[PDB]
């Protein structure tokens, strides 16, 4: 790449001497200045992010990426299977307006098995409905 790393960039070394303290820790700008030294910067002194998929820069993109891909899937599974187990109790409308909070807490805790449960639901056929029994719109 044509971008200089932050360990030897002159503009970044000129800008790191006066990084502003964000939190109440008075040495937060200095520890940020040595944390961002591993990244690479352009001709302005700001840390760019290599996103190509190379694992030497995976900490820029891929390591938070799959981290979000856990949590979103967690939320999605907690939002999905809960609806299935309120498809009938006596009336789903009030159970969607007010929350059956022990059932919701049970799904919220048990949602960390979501990807194996996703392959299990995809293989059992109870994930994707058929293309004919779905209430489509008229052509």
């Amino acid at each position: 790449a044509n971008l200089t790393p932050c360990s030897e960039n002159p503009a970044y070394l000129a800008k790191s001497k006066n990084f502003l303290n964000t939190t109440n820790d008075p040495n937060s700008g200095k520890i940020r200045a040595e944390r961002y030294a591993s990244a690479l910067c352009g001709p302005e002194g700001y840390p760019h992010l290599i996103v190509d998929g190379r694992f030497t820069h995976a900490g820029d993109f891929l390591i938070p990426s799959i981290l979000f891909l856990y949590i979103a899937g967690w939320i999605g599974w907690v939002g999905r299977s809960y609806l299935i187990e309120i498809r009938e109790s006596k009336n789903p409308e009030m159970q969607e307006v007010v929350i059956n909070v022990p059932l919701a807490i049970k799904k919220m805790l048990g949602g960390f098995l979501w990807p194996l449960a996703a392959v299990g639901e995809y293989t059992s056929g109870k994930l994707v409905m058929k293309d004919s029994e779905i209430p489509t719109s008229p052509r």
Partner: protein, 739 residues
């Protein structure tokens, strides 16, 4: 004459888990997601839940107590933040140099940069509400008095909450107690307004006058005597004013002329602190107290003497007016919406009067020096007043639709005004178009004459000049008032009419505001926009019953989208949609009014002062020849003064930049709801329900788009929010940059 029912409603928490019980069509079940929006659209529509005039009135009374608890906990938060997290004693040590700040920000993500150096080592966000000058006018000295006032406010907040529960579930009054409108009127005149004015006159005599007198002498903090020590030792009060050695005895023998040393009629401003004289305001509140409690005995309740308002309304009938006000006493005591329309109209005009009076007669010490306090207090009270006037135009139409019975008021003023609705609106829109051409086409004409390189054909002062002779003559009368038509007054009513330049701490408090031809054109712009908003709201009031386009408008309701695409199209025909249009027109009217205020006061009034007498303003006098052009309003006002919002990053005024862009975002987001219609979004949402049904995740609450009235309501709400947030960020960042 008290009529109270005992335990009408049982106190129970089981109804809280069933939302939508107040209406008949909501308590069945949330079959559709629009029920959710209906749950908020009918939550306070107490006239649609009960239809007996007795249950709704006690529901209103307890709702007033709940809202009073909300105002008391808000006021408690202001006094608590002024006690704990402010610099009120530090600002009281040095009011001219350092700047007030009553909010400290937790440094978490880098927002510790919002705690700018406001002076004296204290960090925080500089407040622009200016209640510090209110506290110095009242007589606060240390933070413990603000803390105990916040504690007492929270006590009265819980007291008002207990009174609301007591007056709905324990001892609720009857309908005859609410319909005792003459007893309510004279109690509110004497015992609320006049007795409260007498209480503040007593506080201004005993607390606010001696503390501000010795603070104007130059006594440092932690050296002022405590406010009760002037009552505990009257010698400390008698050494400041000679009339306090005379005691109460000259007041009862009508020897009030010896009270002249501490109940003065000075007027103008105080030259030491840049506010109103505290002796002047003490005499003022005492006079308002006497006049209100005198007027608080006009209406008969139990002792024969007094005016029952029924024959007052009977007695006023002329040749043009038919049967006169015959029937209005039965209207205004049986319908809460007509009372709400009158009270919102007069509270809105009162709040605009408050804004228009708190800038030329600054009543607080060191208020006119702080330009940010003056600008923020003006524009905020202008906006609250304009909002309440639009609400008057709303509840007039709601009274017409659901609270107007035509069999009771025949040939009275309401029936006669509804009988010639065309002869009112067809002249109101004529004067709207005449003012529109003659206030905006003037601006286009001299914009074109300046763009065509001929400045001698403009409407400037050197060009064809439209001198506003009437207000200039009125300013001449106000300058000539003390000594000829107000002989016991020393100074004028204000120094904005004419007089000397008041300078306090190197800045200008108030100098005379001359009115050139630019003020002529912008006042006609103001009268034009006032006329158009008073056209949309008035033709929402009058044309809410029926019309010639659709004569069945009363049975369709107040809040309906349309009658259909027939008759060419009838969308936005209800009385609700006139409020929907009048909200934008109130936005446009008040935006131009506060723009005229900000530019005229920072070009012809504010600025620093020099010891030889010369005044240099903030924008160096731009309003004379450059406020007459639309390009002049864009270049010299909206481009030049927005640079303080633009270039303020990495500083204390950094949140105003990301509120400037935020307000632009909510404006642009409002355009999606305003421009589009529902059926597109319904045809799209049903496709997303298909994509959810493919994965068996489609909710049993039926998801569908907003109503048409809901789409217009969220469009006008985000429009007004985005425009007001943009103007708030611009006004605050500009006037905090200029000092």
């Amino acid at each position: 004459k008290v009529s109270v029912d005992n335990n009408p409603v049982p106190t129970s928490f089981e109804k809280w888990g069933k939302p939508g019980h107040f209406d008949r069509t909501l308590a069945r079940g949330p079959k559709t997601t629009t029920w959710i929006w209906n749950l908020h659209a009918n939550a306070h529509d107490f006239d649609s839940q009960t239809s007996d005039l007795e249950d709704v009135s006690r529901k209103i009374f307890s709702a007033h107590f709940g809202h009073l608890a909300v105002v008391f906990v808000w006021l408690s938060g202001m006094y608590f933040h002024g006690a704990k997290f402010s610099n009120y004693e530090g600002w009281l040590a040095d009011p001219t140099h350092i700047k007030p700040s009553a909010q400290v920000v937790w440094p978490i993500v880098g927002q510790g940069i919002l705690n700018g150096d406001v002076g004296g080592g204290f960090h925080g966000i500089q407040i622009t509400s200016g209640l510090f000058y209110l506290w110095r006018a009242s007589g606060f000295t240390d933070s413990y008095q603000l803390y105990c006032t916040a504690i007492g406010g929270l006590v009265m907040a819980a007291l008002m909450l207990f009174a609301g529960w007591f007056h709905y579930h324990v001892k609720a009054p009857k309908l005859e107690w609410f319909q005792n409108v003459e007893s309510m009127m004279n109690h509110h005149l004497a015992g609320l307004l006049g007795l409260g004015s007498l209480g503040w006159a007593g506080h201004q005599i005993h607390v606010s006058m001696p503390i501000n007198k010795l603070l104007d002498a130059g006594v440092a903090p932690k050296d002022i005597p405590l406010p009760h020590e002037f009552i505990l030792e009257p010698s400390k009060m008698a050494e400041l004013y000679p009339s306090f050695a005379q005691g109460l005895t000259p007041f009862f023998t009508l020897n009030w002329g010896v009270y002249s040393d501490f109940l003065t009629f000075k007027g103008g401003l105080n030259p030491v602190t840049g506010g109103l004289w505290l002796s002047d305001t003490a005499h003022h509140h005492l006079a308002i107290a006497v006049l209100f409690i005198i007027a608080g005995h006009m209406y008969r309740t139990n002792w024969g003497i007094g005016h029952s308002m029924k024959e007052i309304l009977e007695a006023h009938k002329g040749p043009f007016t038919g049967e006169g006000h015959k029937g209005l006493y039965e209207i205004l005591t049986t319908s809460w919406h007509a009372q709400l329309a009158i009270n919102l109209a007069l509270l809105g005009s009162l709040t605009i009067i408050v804004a228009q009076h708190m800038y030329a007669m600054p009543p607080y010490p060191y208020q006119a020096i702080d330009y940010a306090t003056q600008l923020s207090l003006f524009t905020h009270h202008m906006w609250i007043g304009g909002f309440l006037i639009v609400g008057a135009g709303a509840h007039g139409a709601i009274f017409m639709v659901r609270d107007y019975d035509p069999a009771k008021n025949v040939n009275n003023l309401l029936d006669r005004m509804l009988r010639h609705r065309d002869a009112i609106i067809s002249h109101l829109n004529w004067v709207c178009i005449f003012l529109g051409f003659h206030s905006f086409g003037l601006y286009i004409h001299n914009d074109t004459m300046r763009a065509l390189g001929r400045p001698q054909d403009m409407f400037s002062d050197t060009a064809i000049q439209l001198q506003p002779i009437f207000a200039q003559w009125v300013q001449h009368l106000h300058t000539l008032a003390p000594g000829a038509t107000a002989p016991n007054a020393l100074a004028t009513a204000s120094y904005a009419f004419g007089g000397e330049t008041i300078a306090v701490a190197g800045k200008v408090a108030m100098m005379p505001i001359t009115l050139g031809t630019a003020d002529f054109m912008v006042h006609h712009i103001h009268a034009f926009t006032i006329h158009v908003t008073a056209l949309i709201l008035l033709k929402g009031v009058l044309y809410a019953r029926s019309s010639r386009l659709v004569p069945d408008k009363a049975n369709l309701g107040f809040r309906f989208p349309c009658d259909g695409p027939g008759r060419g199209g009838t969308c936005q025909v209800s009385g609700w949609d006139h409020v929907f249009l009048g909200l934008f027109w109130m936005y446009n009217s008040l935006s131009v009014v506060i723009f005229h205020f900000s530019w005229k006061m920072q070009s012809d009034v504010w600025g620093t002062v020099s010891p030889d007498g010369s005044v240099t303003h903030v924008t160096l006098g731009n309003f004379a020849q450059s406020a007459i052009t639309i390009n002049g309003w864009l270049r010299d006002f909206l481009w030049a003064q927005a640079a303080n919002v633009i270039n303020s990053y990495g500083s204390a005024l950094s949140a105003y930049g990301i509120m400037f862009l935020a307000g632009h975002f909510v404006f642009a987001f409002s355009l999606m709801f305003l421009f589009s219609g529902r059926g597109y979004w319904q045809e799209l949402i049903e496709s997303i329900v298909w994509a959810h049904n493919k994965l068996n995740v489609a909710p049993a609450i039926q998801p569908r788009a907003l109503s048409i009235i809901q789409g217009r309501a969220v469009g006008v709400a985000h429009y007004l929010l985005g425009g007001i947030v943009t103007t708030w960020a611009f006004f605050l960042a500009r006037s905090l940059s200029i000092g």
